[PDB]
Amino acid sequence: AHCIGITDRDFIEGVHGGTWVSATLEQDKCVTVMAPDKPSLDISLETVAIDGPAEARKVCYSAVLTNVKINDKCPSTGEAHLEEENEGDNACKRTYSDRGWGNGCGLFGKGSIVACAKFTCAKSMSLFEVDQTKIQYVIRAQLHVGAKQENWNTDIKTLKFDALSGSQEAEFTGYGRATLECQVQTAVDFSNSYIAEMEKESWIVDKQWAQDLTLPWQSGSGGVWREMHHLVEFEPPHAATIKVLALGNQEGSLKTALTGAMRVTKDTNNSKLYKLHGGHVACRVKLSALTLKGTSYKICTDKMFFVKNPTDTGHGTVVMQVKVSKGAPCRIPVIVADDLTAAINKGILVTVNPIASTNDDEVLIEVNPPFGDSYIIVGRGDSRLTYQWHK
Amino acid sequence: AHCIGITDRDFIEGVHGGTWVSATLEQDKCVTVMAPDKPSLDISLETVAIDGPAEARKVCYSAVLTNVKINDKCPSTGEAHLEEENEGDNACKRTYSDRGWGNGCGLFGKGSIVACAKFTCAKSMSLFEVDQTKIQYVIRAQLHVGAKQENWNTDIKTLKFDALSGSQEAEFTGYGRATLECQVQTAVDFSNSYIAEMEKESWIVDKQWAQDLTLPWQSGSGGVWREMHHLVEFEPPHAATIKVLALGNQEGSLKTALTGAMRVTKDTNNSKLYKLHGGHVACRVKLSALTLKGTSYKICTDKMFFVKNPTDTGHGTVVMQVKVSKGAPCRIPVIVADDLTAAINKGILVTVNPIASTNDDEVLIEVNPPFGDSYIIVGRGDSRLTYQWHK
Amino acid sequence: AHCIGITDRDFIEGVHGGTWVSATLEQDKCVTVMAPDKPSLDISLETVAIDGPAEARKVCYSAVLTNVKINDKCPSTGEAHLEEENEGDNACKRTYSDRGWGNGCGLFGKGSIVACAKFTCAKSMSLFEVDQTKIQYVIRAQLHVGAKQENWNTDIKTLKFDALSGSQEAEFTGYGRATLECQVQTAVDFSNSYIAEMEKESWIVDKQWAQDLTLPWQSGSGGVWREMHHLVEFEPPHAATIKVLALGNQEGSLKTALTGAMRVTKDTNNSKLYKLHGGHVACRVKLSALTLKGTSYKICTDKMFFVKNPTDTGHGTVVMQVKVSKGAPCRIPVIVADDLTAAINKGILVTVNPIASTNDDEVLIEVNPPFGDSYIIVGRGDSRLTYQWHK
């Protein structure tokens, strides 16, 4: 079951005869819900997904400024203006200046100068409103049947939760069913946030922070740009003229500020599906309807062999694969004990009742051994498998 | 001597044998200068004026507001925008308004609204930039020839002053010449100020105040009205509509604030001459080129008449008119005394040498009497006129 | 001269027995240098420049990665390796992915990952050396000719200065000579710095600061980027996959850091010719060889008047321009009194003997009346062009 492959693994044990076991899930992590007479259930949060956000704003982070014009008025001869001031994309600025006593000047002091330049956005990030009702939480659930790793990707049941389907049944063929309830409404605070997007790149950002950006922005339906000041500088006026510059691409600064946000991956297939990293959710599992498949079966009592020897795992837990050699739809007895006399089975099975359901069935088994050295033991009689182990 | 009629008058006496006599003149006041053997001279400031100043700004004080347009978007979706936001002559405001299923929304959040309206100035104050080198000055000057009042408007000399005309000559047909050194260009007491104008009314006001004035204003050459929010008001939005209103005419409030300023009149005839009701002049007068007419004339030998009896006038001086019936090309002996049997020339003539030109010519004579009880005497011998006077 | 219009100016004045008057020049300042028996001098600094300085570095701010590839090996199976790890144009990271049966490894544990991408630069910032032996200077000066406004077109002397020489001589026709000695080599601030250049913008940057940029950089005409780390990030490995990204264009952050460095402007008539800013040169000037052209001529004392009447100006002189209608070749006197008697004087002329060479032209002249009220007087005799002034 797929939790073997995840580094952060939590074992959660149900109290005997209890029904509802709570767990908390996070995308780097998985949980193996485990209960005393029922096969263990691996559960993990695969993704949080957001479908069809609405474009609220675009924020420009580089501007190709073009077609500057300037006009000027001599001291106490009036005040200057430009036709471009009547038009919203010209980003104009107005200021006094000194002016030359040789330049038709009347008197010492200040002339007046006005300049305008056609601001156009070269690159912008898009800010999307999160359609909070649309959020899907996608859960993987997989039962410890003892399926070999090749089969995990087909055996995993995938469940999608949103507020319309807060309860779901995972049904496992022959093992019964488990009911999941997940707290989709509580787990995230996307009400006060935008998805922020850049070329091939995306983030989820605080709605205040993204409004408070000192950058020129556009109303998402494509209107005027609204605060040109944050990208256009005018060099303090020369007596005859004033000269204008665009600031550089703020992309490097803007990504620097974004580093604290949760990253988002835009899907490969959908145009407008956004998958969100690091989101988490709480769930409860009704284990009660799960059952062991083969508690009816006879004990294998026949030659067995390891297809993969018991390896360690980071979980302090041993994983092995066993094939029953012949003639037996049967349950494989597994012990781990201090002595080859196997006085007491100190270790705990995670594959709570391992079964070879048919003569070819390659059975994965997971066992949590005691600390210290001990012997894992499989099968019975003259043909036991054994393997020395250490904590 | 038109400064008989002017209400505020200063006499000034030239130092005996000083070629230049100092004087100062004010917008509705007169100096009359006397020197011990020269005919007395009236000098008066007719106007301080500026011809064709440049308009710096127009300031809207009533606006009509038309073609209101609104765009509204539900709280889930993006920022609202209008085409009108790109046009300079639209006053426009952006705000967020409560919405819900009463308005066709999906969600109950704060929707977005923008509303723009076409702004047009109905009436505006014009601000004209003064420039002290452009100030014209005009001086009215007249000798005490003793002409009747009906002749004063032709005998008054008009002297015009500007940056070039730094000194001027007045020539009086029988009485020689004087020249004025009016330092008018520095005598002014205003700077960095606008002539402020409304229909048939005008003012002069501080530049910085008129820039601080909280009203929409326009560059003198035209173009966009650029602080429209000081006349356009938006009533807070209802869920799908916002009501935008122009404020009423501000001219009462505006000229209330102007009430403390010095007044100006646009000329009754000229296109662009503005006359300023203040300022003052400093001057000096070269009197030594004046000569008393006809002192070699014979004395009146025969009967005379008062035709306007001597009267007081507020300057503390006496004015009379006398007709010469016969023997006319003669000087009229004027004496003010206090011992009628043995008269002495105790009082001081302002009409320093009165002469008749032709039979039944009527002269005017102004005389400054001594303190106390006194006689004013005109003519000689038994047919002389005599009049009682006091203080 | 032309320096009247400069935003700020300073006064230095010598006395007889003194010589070698000290001065300081700055690239947009001016000084008036004066001496009692000799014409006043205006001085200013026109350009500091360097021609074709040497390449120090290029610093990249916009990496483009391509052709990434990866090698991965199971735990306890040695170290992964890539040929790209061993050649210059590939950035690489070597690290470990946690792996197990879920990822095709036979054992559970950390297996090594290495990944490399081809690195190319879309843009980079050049750093050029301050080749201080090549630091060109150009120095501007003029004497107080008295010439009217436009003649500044070609009257101004402007002088090349260089590390090749210490001093240069002014030649004034009719006004003698002067020597300016500049210590050109040593005044500069550029102890350890580079010309930093981006496309169409440039800066003078601290050498150590520039070397200490957290950015990939290349020596001269190199073939390798001597650091590559700072623009490449690797998202932590998942199974056998690791994915590599360029950071965004740092240009905006870099210009943000460069803000507050001294500007540079490249010229266009020659490539790689750089005008600096903030240039400095402390100098001394030998005034003793200067002379006045006209001191022996007679005073004008003829029909004369203002053509640009006196005004203040921002550095504290009074400036005026005047005409004699016709007269002799003569000197125009100006004197400043505190009474119209003009026999007692206190103000200073900076044009000491302005020259009316011929009748058809004006002279532009300057004066410094004392604190408080004062009279400017130009001409003498009957042409009493009196013009009052205050502070």
Dihedral pair phi/psi, residue C78, rounded to 5°: 75, -160
Alpha-carbon distance A357 to A346, whole Å? 26
**Cα-based torsion angle of the residue sequence A72, A78, A83, A89 in order, rounded to the nearest 10 degrees:** 70
Q: Enumerate the residues of chain C whose CB falls inside 8 A of the CB of residue B167.
A: 384
B337 plus B386 within the same structural domain: yes
Alpha-carbon distance A3 to A22, whole Å? 17
Alpha-carbon distance C214 to C225, whole Å? 13
Closest CA to A91 of A225, A236, A219: A225
β-pair partners for B367: B318, B349
Alpha-carbon distance C48 to C137, whole Å? 5
B278 plus B342 within the same structural domain: no
Q: DSSP E strands: which ranges in C241-361?
A: 241-246, 262-266, 273-276, 280-286, 304-312, 318-324, 330-331, 334-337, 348-349, 355-356
C69 plus C176 within the same structural domain: no
Q: How far is CA A173 from CA A142, A156, A358, C40, in A?
A: 12, 12, 16, 108
β-pair partners for C43: C31, C141
A43 plus A137 within the same structural domain: yes
Cβ pair C309, C320 in contact under 8 A: yes
Residue C384 in domain? yes
Residue B89 in domain? no
Structural resolution in Å? 3.3
User: What is the least distance, in Å, from the CA of A251 to any CA of chain C?
Assistant: 5
Q: Enumerate the residues of chain A whose CB falls inside 8 A of the CB of residue C62.
A: 249
Alpha-carbon distance B44 to B152, whole Å? 13
DSSP A164: T
And the tokens for C217?
Answer: 């950089």
- Longest alpha-carbon distance in chain C: 118
Dihedral pair phi/psi, residue A258, rounded to 5°: -70, -15
Report CA Rg, chain C. Answer: 34
Chain B's closest residue to C322, CA to CA, is: B164
Give the three-class secondary structure for B298: strand
And the tokens for B358?
Answer: 């032709």
Q: Enumerate the residues of chain A whose CB falls inside 8 A of the CB of residue C253.
A: 250, 252-253, 256
Alpha-carbon distance B219 to B238, whole Å? 36
Alpha carbon B354 to its chain's center: 34
Alpha-carbon distance B228 to C144, whole Å? 51
How many CB atoms within 10 Å of residue A343? 10
Give the three-class secondary structure for B35: strand
C48 plus C62 within the same structural domain: no
CATH code assigned at C14: 2.60.98.10
User: What is the least distance, in Å, from the CA of C302 to any CA of chain B?
Assistant: 14
* B173 touching chain C per CB within 8 A: no
Alpha-carbon distance B99 to B193, whole Å? 51
DSSP A369: P
Q: Which residues, 6+ apart, have CB-to-CB distance to B254 below 8 Å?
A: B61, B125, B213, B215
Residue C297 in domain? no
Residues 298-357 of C with CB under 8 A from B: 305-306, 309, 340
* B283 touching chain C per CB within 8 A: no
Q: DSSP E strands: which ranges in C173-216?
A: 176-181, 193-198, 201-206
For this PDB entry, the determination method is cryo-EM
CATH code assigned at C380: 2.60.40.350
* C96 touching chain A per CB within 8 A: no
Range of the domain at C66: 55-128+192-271
C164 plus C264 within the same structural domain: no
User: What is the least distance, in Å, from the CA of A78 to any CA of chain B?
Assistant: 4
A160 plus A37 within the same structural domain: yes
A157 plus A274 within the same structural domain: yes
Q: Which of B253, B286, B319 is the last residue of a domain?
A: B286
Question: E strand or H helix at C106, and its extent?
Answer: none
B349 plus B373 within the same structural domain: yes
Q: DSSP E strands: which ranges in A119-229?
A: 121-129, 136-143, 157-161, 167-172, 176-182, 193-198, 201-206, 217-219
Q: Enumerate the residues of chain C whose CB falls inside 8 A of the CB of residue B19.
A: none
And the tokens for B338?
Answer: 């206090």
Alpha-carbon distance B109 to A150, whole Å? 50
Question: E strand or H helix at C207, and its extent?
Answer: helix C207-211
And the tokens for C334?
Answer: 């100006």
Q: Do A149 and C103 touch (CB under 8 A)?
A: no
Q: Which residues, 6+ apart, have CB-to-CB distance to B151 below 8 Å?
A: none
Residue A212 in domain? no
And the tokens for B176?
Answer: 């020689």
Alpha-carbon distance B18 to C58, whole Å? 84
Q: Enumerate the residues of chain B whose CB falls inside 8 A of the CB of residue C340.
A: 20, 284
Give how many domains chain C has, as a whole number.
3
C120 plus C8 within the same structural domain: no
Alpha-carbon distance B27 to B137, whole Å? 11
B139 plus B281 within the same structural domain: yes
User: What is the least distance, in Å, from the CA of A269 to any CA of chain B?
Assistant: 24
Task: Find the length of chain B.
Answer: 391
Residue C295 in domain? no
* A169 touching chain B per CB within 8 A: no
How many CB atoms within 10 Å of residue B44? 23
And the tokens for A205?
Answer: 């950002």
Burial letters B265-286, b for 16+ CB under 10 A, else e: ebeeeeeebbbbeebbbbbbbb
Cβ pair B136, B49 in contact under 8 A: yes
Q: Do A81 and B219 touch (CB under 8 A)?
A: yes
Cβ pair C284, A284 in contact under 8 A: no
Beta strand pairing status for C136-143 and C38-51? antiparallel
- CA B175, B181, B184, B189 dihedral sign is negative
Q: Do C306 and B183 touch (CB under 8 A)?
A: no
* C389 touching chain B per CB within 8 A: yes
User: What is the least distance, in Å, from the CA of A207 to any CA of chain C?
Assistant: 22
Task: Find the length of chain A.
Answer: 391
**Cα-based torsion angle of the residue sequence A302, A303, A304, A305 in order, rounded to the nearest 10 degrees:** 180
CATH code assigned at C206: 3.30.387.10
Residue C292 in domain? no
Tell me how many residue pairs between chain A and chain B have CB atoms under 8 A apart. Answer: 78
Cβ pair B286, B41 in contact under 8 A: no
Q: Do B77 and A222 touch (CB under 8 A)?
A: no
Cβ pair C2, A102 in contact under 8 A: yes
Residue B316 in domain? yes
Residue B350 in domain? yes
Q: Enumerate the residues of chain A whose CB falls inside 8 A of the CB of residue C255.
A: 247-248
Q: Do A253 and C255 touch (CB under 8 A)?
A: no
A235 plus A374 within the same structural domain: no
Alpha-carbon distance C305 to C319, whole Å? 15
Alpha-carbon distance B185 to C387, whole Å? 8
Beta strand pairing status for B9-13 and B30-35? parallel
Question: E strand or H helix at B187, and its extent?
Answer: helix B184-187
